[PDB]
Amino acid sequence: GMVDREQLVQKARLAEQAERYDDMAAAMKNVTELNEPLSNEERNLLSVAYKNVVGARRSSWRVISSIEQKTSADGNEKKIEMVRAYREKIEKELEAVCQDVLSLLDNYLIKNCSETQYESKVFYLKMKGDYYRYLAEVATGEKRATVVESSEKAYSEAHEISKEHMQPTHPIRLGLALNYSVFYYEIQNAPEQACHLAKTAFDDAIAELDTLNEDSYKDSTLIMQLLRDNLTLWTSDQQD
Amino acid sequence: GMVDREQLVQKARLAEQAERYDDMAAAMKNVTELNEPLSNEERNLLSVAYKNVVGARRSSWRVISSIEQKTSADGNEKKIEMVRAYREKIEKELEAVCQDVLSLLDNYLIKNCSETQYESKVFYLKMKGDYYRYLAEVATGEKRATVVESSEKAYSEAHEISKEHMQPTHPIRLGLALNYSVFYYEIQNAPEQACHLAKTAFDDAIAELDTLNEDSYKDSTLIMQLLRDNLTLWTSD
Amino acid sequence: KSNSISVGEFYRDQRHSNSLGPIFDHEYITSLDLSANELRDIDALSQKCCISVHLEHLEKLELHQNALTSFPQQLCETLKSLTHLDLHSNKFTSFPSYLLKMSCIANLDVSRNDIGPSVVLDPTVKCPTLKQFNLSYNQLSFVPENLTDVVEKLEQLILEGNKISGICSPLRLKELKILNLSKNHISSLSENFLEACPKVESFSARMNFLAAMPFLPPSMTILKLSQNKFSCIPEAILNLPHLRSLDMSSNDIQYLPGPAHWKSLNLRELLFSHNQISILDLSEKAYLWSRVEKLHLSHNKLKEIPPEIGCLENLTSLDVSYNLELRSFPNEMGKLSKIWDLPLDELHLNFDFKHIGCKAKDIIRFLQQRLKKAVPYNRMKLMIVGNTGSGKTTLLQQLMKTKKSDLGMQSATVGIDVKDWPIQIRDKRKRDLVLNVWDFAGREEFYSTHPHFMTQRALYLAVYDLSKGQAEVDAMKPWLFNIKARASSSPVILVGTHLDVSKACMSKITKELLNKRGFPAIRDYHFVNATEESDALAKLRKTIINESLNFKIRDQLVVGQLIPDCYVELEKIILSERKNVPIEFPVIDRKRLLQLVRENQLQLDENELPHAVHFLNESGVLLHFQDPALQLSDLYFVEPKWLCKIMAQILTVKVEGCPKHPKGIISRRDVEKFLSKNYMSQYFKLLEKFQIALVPSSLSDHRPVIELPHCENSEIIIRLYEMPYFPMGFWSRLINRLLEISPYALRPNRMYWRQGIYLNWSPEAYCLVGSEVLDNHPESFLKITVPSCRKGCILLGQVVDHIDSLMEEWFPGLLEIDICGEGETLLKKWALYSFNDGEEHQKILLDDLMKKAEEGDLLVNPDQPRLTIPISQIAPDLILADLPRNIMLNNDELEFEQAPEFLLGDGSFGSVYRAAYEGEEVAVKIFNKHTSLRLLRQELVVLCHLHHPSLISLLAAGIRPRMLVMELASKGSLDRLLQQDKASLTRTLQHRIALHVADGLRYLHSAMIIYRDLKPHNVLLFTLYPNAAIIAKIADYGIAQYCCRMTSEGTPGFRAPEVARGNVIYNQQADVYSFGLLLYDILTTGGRIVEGLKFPNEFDELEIQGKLPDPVKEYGCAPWPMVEKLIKQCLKENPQERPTSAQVFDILNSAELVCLTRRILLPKNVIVECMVATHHNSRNASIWLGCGHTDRGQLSFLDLNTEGYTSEEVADSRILCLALVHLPVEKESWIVSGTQSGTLLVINTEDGKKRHTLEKMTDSVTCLYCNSFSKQSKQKNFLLVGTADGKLAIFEDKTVKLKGAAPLKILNIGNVSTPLMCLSESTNSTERNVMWGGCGTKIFSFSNDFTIQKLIETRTSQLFSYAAFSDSNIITVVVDTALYIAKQNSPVVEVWDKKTEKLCGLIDCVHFLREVMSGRVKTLCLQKNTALWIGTGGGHILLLDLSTRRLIRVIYNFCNSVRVMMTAQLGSLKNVMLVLGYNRKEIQSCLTVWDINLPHEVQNLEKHIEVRKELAEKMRRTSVE
Ligand SMILES: Nc1nc2c(ncn2[C@@H]2O[C@H](COP(=O)(O)OP(=O)(O)O)[C@@H](O)[C@H]2O)c(=O)[nH]1
């Protein structure tokens, strides 16, 4: 029955030590509903909790979608019917969680961010683009068009702020670049644009690795090698 | 036969492919409430689904109890009270799941077992013993004693049926032996008894491995590795 | 899925039980063989019984191996055409002399008989027909006296292995070809011995006592004279103008006359081994042996090979091994590339050989490159080695005269810190030797990687740290022991490093204890200060230089070794590249090295690189690892000073947040370290493939307390390995080398104690490879204990083999008996035993050497012999008891005798003998001294679990002495049978032999073992009866010999293109290529081998590429080109493009392949729908086709012996069918035809102009039939015309000549809407050949009356499944016990009855076709009485047995659509059926030819497969139990 902020964040800490992410997500719901700007640690907790809760359902969704695609060839009405119903159930669950997340960012986090809180607004725009991407991953048609437009607008804003005030080796900006490129490659189906953006971010972070502190250095790398893997995967299947 | 069983079992299958364990747990629960004996595939799917849902909670209970013990020395009332509330909440979730599976077992699954259906009754006694020791992991006091008494009774019945009716090398019987041994060591805190039953099951299986079919060979040996591993671990002092 | 990251997740980044883990599973016959039956007498067949008249035409008999005595005179006169009289091992006493009275007899073989002392020939017989008078291995005392006056045409008189002592007759015989006096006791030969034999070519006298040749005739070709007592070769051999080979081994000669004394231009093989030759004169005329190909000079006292040996370019197999004083190969032999074999046994050269290649052809290339330009090489290794800290870095930094020494306090050495420093000596010698200094790691943590870097060519140093004098030197003994263990002949210079600090009496202890007791050759010592330059430093420098220059391992002077200048240039380029390689990743890939060698003007190729890189590795520039297990041959490590520095990083720093693993055990974790300089994990795993690190280094040095289940001193057996000090790289490498030791399941309990394993499976079997130190004994012991149970014996055998292999591989210094002094050998491998069974209170030592010396008995006893202990219970490694118990020797029942050489018959002068075992004849193999006990058990342990029916299977093996027992190949190796018993080959047994070897190859490949050496010399046969279960067998000894000691290069004649070149690694595709070569040879029946024996270099260089000639064109044999397509598939140069063994076996497994003779691809874009065969001209049958590509008619003559297709336009309208009508009179066969215009056209066989069309018939002709009606009491024939109206224009045989033949009986059966399209004839002749034809849909028949006998309707069916399948025009009809009818586009065949006229059966093609994967009936053809064939509209053939079972087999994947279906007979291979299918990719009518003999075979072979599978699955229970 603990309500205050400290008990909430400590409950979130226990949850992340307990591998129970739903309670963590509720705790961050309440912490953000306290309408106070979030520090780095609470922000990280909110991010990881909601990332896990969306990732579980996303894994369930792509598994079920692959099963549906395989079973569609055989053509049995009942199995396709129940598969479609279960996929719709998972889709509704994803839509509920993502709508909660985006309502939270629109109503609480971006609103109380000052004009000088550049990193906070970029980070929030970052997950909002990510979660609109998650919506699009199950959306088709006009709803898909609306969500991709929303995610593109959010991503362009986030990229512009990132360019204007972050230095390129900041891990937040690199993660934004990775998720933007994933959006371009997977949703926009424009691998050239994603490759160009990823290579630009890669070269820019090369430009500054000379004068990076080791604490920031490994933070830069542990995103950089993944970025380079994404580039190599995208550049290994060109026109042949 | 008024509710479509095949739809439920196919839903459970697409769930086990989709790691949605709560949904398979509910579907298995329903199809067993349909009041007809469960096949080996359905029986083991029920087993794995409920084992998974109880095991995630068991792991959560273990980690939170560990942090409780490591933080109680610091003398922080807020920390201790919060961790205590969280661990009691984990325990109450475990108790809900466990009373559910126990009612499902005794009310439905054991009741409709014929006298000659050795394998099913052995398996269900193994399950009830497993869940009873699961409670013992979180039970204390007189409740702890009552649960371990029930677990010992069910284990004794399962062991007696299996040893009287079927061979040692059957996977269910050696798994029964493994669960009996771990109950003796971890709950009873009687390493000598656990080692004795473990070695008895071991050499009883070895006595007849010569004429084991290759199909059952891995089924026996992949868990015989576990018996020998705990035997090695236990006698290491 | 793309890598998406939550940056929050980015910021965020005990077992205690083991319960149930959800496993949740899921024409008289000629050849009669009477050899195997024990016949004591053959007199039963000599009488006048029912078989006495049939024997007259035998021509072939085998009465060998039985116990006949005194062959009856009646039988030899019974038959008068016998020409292959073969019988040996019969118990006769004297030659009958009555066995030569028949008319024409040759091949008279008596090869083992106990013929009397004299074999005098009765002069009352004058038979010259004898061609082989084989008198092998008799008790003869004198050559048959009446050979001259009785047998005149004798060619092969073989009397080897006899006791003919006195000088023989002048031998007035004129027709000899080959003479053999081998293994006789001869004093000499008379001057008129061979003066009356002007035709001999292969005189061979072996194992005799001869002195000189008595005027050998110029006719000589082959002379074998090894094993004699000489002093020089007499001139009578030296003047033979046609001598081709000369075997002169096992002799005692002194001088070989040079080229100007042989007077021959065709010397090829020169065998002069085991003799005493001092000079090899070649200077006078080097080109005079330009064609010599073989030259063996082994076991001779050769001084040096003259430079003129570069001129005989034909030399192929050179042998100068066992010389022990050669020490040099001239650079001139590098021009002589034809060598494929050059043994290098027991001689030392100016270079190190046999690293991983050196397969006797890279040596030639090395010598040639050295001939190009030879320059001195000056690169030594100075491996400074210390202990925990000494004057190593401080002494090296001042030995190098490094003035700077910027680091005032240099930290501890990590890795080896490889450095190179030049020394230009300011003296007369300009030689500027540069040598690398490797200051190894002092600290004991790194001690498990150093042995990798201790090469036999080095000048080691060790450093005292004299401050702790007389005590620290005791701790340095392990280092010198390791130096001896790694490089026995490597000088060591110990140096003191501390004179400013304080104890100089260390010289006394060094000279007293450390000097020369089991330690390397300490050549000098010094006491330098190692702090500032002084006269001591100058003396140390002078000593180090003087010792480097006088290294002389094997007296060779390594400091000035000679190599090709290409080596120097490549060393220079890699040195230049060293400063241009990324610091973060200095490894160079193979492509980079190739680009580097391309950039400059180097002269090596892709094949000179492997030896170049290894020599340069031996001289410390770049480390490259060519071992296939370490999949890092692509990587090249330039500037190793980085690689060692990185490999040693892990041993110094280990960090864990939580102790998830015990100390010494590390989970697989990656550390980025350098980023983006490509990052590659193969070196990360190399860190484990080095066996460096699970890190055995720093892994629980103290042993855990461990108690055995049974320690009653009787059920356990112990072995001890007392050695002075455990080498550094021993215990970690032993622990990793043990890996897993499998008792012949569940993985054991593995414990990893720094020196110890103790892996166990049960209280029944365990293995404790411990390390304990006994009190009052400074030495270190490796105690190893295992139970006495059988599994324990297997475990002990495997671990003792592994530890001995490790010691033989990495530490040759230890296991080397030092003759100087005494045979201490530094490894006193003890064996502990106890007479008192239990509570013996003492374990008695006994050296393993003396125990293995006690091999004369099986039981070991002490001086008090009443109580005894078995050896096999004390050391199951000496007794071959560790292997499965079914392969014991059991010498009691082994009826064996090594001494006789007539039991040596298996193989020519081979080591495989013949003896009796368990009551049956077996072929025993005697092992020589080359194979050691470890090698032999390594071979037999892998040979003890092959067990495949078409493979030789080990039966017994044992000691006293060392032999091996395998199954006896009664027919011997396949090469002999394909070279002189081709008549036994009859176009079918080739297929069975190929099947059996293909099964063996497939089984071996499934076991991940490839033969790598598969020749007709390796196909051991057992019977020649084709219908046998076990026929062919491939020797499994080749793979054992390959894997035991690593003929891996293979025979040049039968070798894959990728193996002879040696550039690419080998695979199963080489075995596939060799199998295709076997197919080619077995098709040629030894035709290629004969052509290759006289031209070996071309025989190899022609088959090295896929340009083998057409077998049919070059060699006279049956074409059978289907298997030629299989060969071309297996002859492909691309390895992966060749089919795998499983596929070729399966396509061979089909019974249709032997039957399908061939396939003819008729030229592009032609359509044909009709065909007729020719049977009367059975000598050669050509095929006549029609035309469908043109609306007009065009006859298509096609031959079969020439495959020559011709086109001739003959009709204005398309011809639909043809027919052959033959007239016994006038000897001709007219060809009639029918077209859509009704123009019945007749054409002569040999005349293309005598064409006269018959009556123009109103409609389109659909069928033409030639029949057999002899109703006029004479040979008569008619003709039948199938047309589109049912009008039968029946003609006569002889009336077709006249223009417009008058029909006999015009029978209009059908209507305009009911046409006629098919005819057939009765299957039997007792019904006067009732003829059944199909008009429209109903079936109808006549007889000689030519009236409609039946009017059976098929549309009115009471089992209607579909209408049009029965309501359509007929297509085919066959006359048998039942009637099979197929309609147009009808995939269902109807079975009608002749009498009852009912649908007895309804067989659907799809009812079988849909079970294996369009598809409908296209054509039909029935056999005589056995099988039916349905021609599917696709590319599937179904075999229909009309008797009991419908489906026999479906043959698909050969074509795409089957258009025609009819039989024929061709060229003495009568009764062959023909198909013409399509293979669309454009219509290609693939004419394909299939013999019809198989209806028995198609089921007999599968009966040979079902019986094959059962024993391919039955006696695998031996592997289980
Ligand atoms: N004071 C003194 N120190 C010495 C003398 N000889 C060697 N040393 C010390 O020995 C050390 C050499 O380190 P070293 O053994 O080469 O390190 P390692 O290669 O890892 O074994 C230096 O730090 C020197 O100070 C000496 O004569 N006097």
Author numbering:
A (entry chain B): 0 to 239
B (entry chain C): 0 to 236
C (entry chain A): 907 to 919, 930 to 942, 982 to 1457, 1463 to 1637, 1644 to 1659, 1668 to 1718, 1726 to 2027, 2031 to 2397, ...
How is this structure described in the published paper?
Leucine-rich repeat kinase 2 (LRRK2) is an essential regulator in cellular signaling and a major contributor to Parkinson’s disease (PD) pathogenesis. 14-3-3 proteins are critical modulators of LRRK2 activity, yet the structural basis of their interaction has remained unclear.
Subsequent 3D reconstruction of the cross-linked particles yielded a 3.96 Å map, with a density corresponding to a LRRK2 monomer and additional density matching a 14-3-3 dimer, confirming LRRK2/14-3-3 complex formation. The complex demonstrated a 1:1 stoichiometry between a LRRK2 monomer and a 14-3-3 dimer, hereafter referred to as the LRRK2:14-3-32 complex. The N-terminal region (residues 1-906), including the ARM and ANK domains, was not observed in the density map, suggesting that they are likely flexible. The elongated LRR domain covered the kinase domain, occluding the active site and thus preventing substrate access to the kinase domain. Our cryo-EM structure of the LRRK2:14-3-32 complex reveals that a 14-3-3 dimer engages LRRK2 at two distinct sets of interfaces: primary interactions occur at pS910 and pS935 motifs, while secondary interactions involve the COR domain.
